[PDB]
Amino acid sequence: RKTRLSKNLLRMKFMQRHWYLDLPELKEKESFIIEEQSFLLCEDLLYGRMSFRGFNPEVEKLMLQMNA
Amino acid sequence: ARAARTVLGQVVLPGEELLLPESRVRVVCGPGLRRCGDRLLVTKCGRLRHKEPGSGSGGGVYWVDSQQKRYVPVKGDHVIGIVTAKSGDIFKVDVGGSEPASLSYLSFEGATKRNRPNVQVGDLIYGQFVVANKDMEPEMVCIDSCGRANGMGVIGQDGLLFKVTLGLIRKLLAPDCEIIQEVGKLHPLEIVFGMNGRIWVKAKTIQQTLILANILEACEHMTSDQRKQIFSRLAES
Amino acid sequence: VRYCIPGERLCNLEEGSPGSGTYTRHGYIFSSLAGCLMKSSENGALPVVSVVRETESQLLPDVGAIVTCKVSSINSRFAKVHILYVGSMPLKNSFRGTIRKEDVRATEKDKVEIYKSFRPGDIVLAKVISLGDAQSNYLLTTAENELGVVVAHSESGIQMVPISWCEMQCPKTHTKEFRKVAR
8 A cells, every 4th residue: 555655756857846352442333434436325216127118018018017 | 734624616637636634524425526535636627616414414415517428337327238249148239338338138127038138139238237346247137126117127119319428417406407307398208327428319300309319429528609590499399 | 706707617416416597518517697606405415506696696485374465456356466565575576366256255155256356556465375387476365364465545646544344434533444454
């Protein structure tokens, strides 16, 4: 008798589908100003690829998605 | 060296140091600024600008709306590119910067060794950077991190690719732009804005495409006369 | 002590053998450099003659070495360096080495990332493995926690301190850069 499969069969593919340091001078310290070069944090911007009344409706749903 | 708050809408010139009020509140140095001790050195002429987050703890953010043409590889920016060659697994694409960026044959949406993408030399792309730094060549990718190309990949064909200033883009992509809204009423279209001053456009016919490209490359200072002139032309196409 | 010259004979093959900086003609050895000669002797009693220009006598960074270097160029694949101190004795003949991606930490994780381990213009020390064949490309490794970066300059001009295993900070202002800190 038997109830369960085998392994050789159950392997096939169609089936499966340091250290630290405490500086009292600089332990609890954090940067106060950070250098950025991105105009996004700076300023909000829409999604590049867009479309107007018909061309590539996929881009229309992308607009609806990324612009909110 | 005075009143960062009083020159948030004035023209700053390089060399100028400006200092900010306070124990303190973390802030961020924009792209055209630089830090000297506890002061902010200016590195590019510009109409200074500020912003604050909806919260009250974030502090603020400062920058300069500098106009220019040359691009610099930055991280997390959507960019048009032009495949310049292919070396084995990775193919090199131009961006308009110091050196050419690199792609990987398995970065496109749904690709593996047994499924390679259709990229031919001269083909143009809409990707984004994941390593943009001054010390290493920039690598880009045409797929969000989750694993879906949310509009990325090869552009296509049958369009016009031209080039404009970067501030022009930084303005057009604003949610309160008038030109790109009014254009959605005359004749249809579909266009890619690349933050490297490079723009791609497509419409049904070609006369329209040309009129559109001219508008865009001029819309920084168009006069109402020329404005309605090209609008009437589009209405007559 | 005697200084020799690129033409003078030194000895028969029956009274020595060429070690370096020499050559052989019929039944004789002949020097090849302006320098000092030396005939070492093995327990075999047959001497080995050699000639040396002790100005830069000789150095050799062997496998189990600990050699410093400076990070010039980098890539997502490897980072190239120049050899300065082999141990503690500098060498004006700056050799050129390389550090691979995986050969960066003892843990060997692929999660490692160069730009967060190294930067161009900082000094490290590592252990060579392969001498190289054509270009004598030294391949260095840092698969150890007391290896890697020791001194590293800040965003612009400040020298930073090795806080932790993969963190470094400048003392004047506050900013957490990422490297493969040593020790």
